[PDB]
């Protein structure tokens, strides 16, 4: 596919949302032919660097957030991957990334226990005009009864000013995690749960 021309034009306008939507519409020619290809290789030229990163917007983040609900992986490639001197480093990186994005598993934890689920919660800052916004999301890296292993993240959710999940929100996200683990292991309880939080646990949160 070819990037539609107006993207270049909006590159002058410095509108990140418009550029991301135009890129999605450029890839829209690949929506019907999802079976033909496994991984898409979106390339963002250095000339688009003005919209690469600016306050309140992340170009790769927005692109992947737009493409994920459509269920087609992308491995965004910028000039960095080309620039980078050591070729073997980048080649290992891209090769492993593409193989794992296709659906394969390059490697797995040896002798990993399938009855333990390792939860991990993190957060991010959105600089609101009036206050701040804390976005908290969880991730799981458990190993199902099969041979492959799973790795899934999800939002913890309406508005949060502090990164500490309350009783309701934390019990909800942990119940969702428990259902996720149950779905893979036929319904067996996780005999041990690990939770890695970047900040301390509150009394109510425990």
């Amino acid at each position: 596919c070819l990037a539609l021309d107006e993207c270049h034009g909006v590159a002058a306008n410095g509108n990140g949302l418009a550029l991301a939507d135009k890129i999605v519409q450029s890839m829209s020619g690949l929506f019907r032919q999802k079976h033909a290809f496994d991984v898409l290789l979106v390339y963002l030229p250095a000339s688009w660097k003005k919209c690469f990163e600016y306050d309140g917007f992340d170009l790769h983040d927005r692109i992947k957030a737009k493409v994920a609900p459509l269920n087609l992986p992308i491995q965004i490639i910028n000039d960095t991957a080309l620039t980078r001197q050591c070729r073997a480093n980048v080649m290992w990186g891209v090769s492993v990334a593409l193989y794992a994005k296709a659906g394969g598993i390059p490697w797995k934890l040896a002798d990993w226990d399938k009855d333990e689920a390792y939860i991990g919660l993190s957060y991010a800052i959105k600089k609101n005009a009036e206050g701040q916004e804390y976005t908290t999301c969880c991730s799981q890296v458990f190993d199902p009864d099969g041979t492959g292993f799973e790795f899934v993240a999800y939002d913890t959710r309406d508005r949060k000013g502090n990164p500490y999940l309350s009783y309701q929100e934390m019990q909800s996200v942990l119940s969702k995690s428990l259902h996720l683990y149950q779905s893979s292991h036929n319904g067996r309880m996780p005999r041990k749960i690990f939770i890695h939080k970047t900040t301390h646990f509150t009394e109510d949160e425990i």
Partner: peptide
């Protein structure tokens, strides 16, 4: 009793 001994994962751990 929670974890057995002839499991491969527990043996490795």
């Amino acid at each position: 009793q929670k974890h057995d001994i002839n499991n491969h994962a527990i043996k490795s751990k």
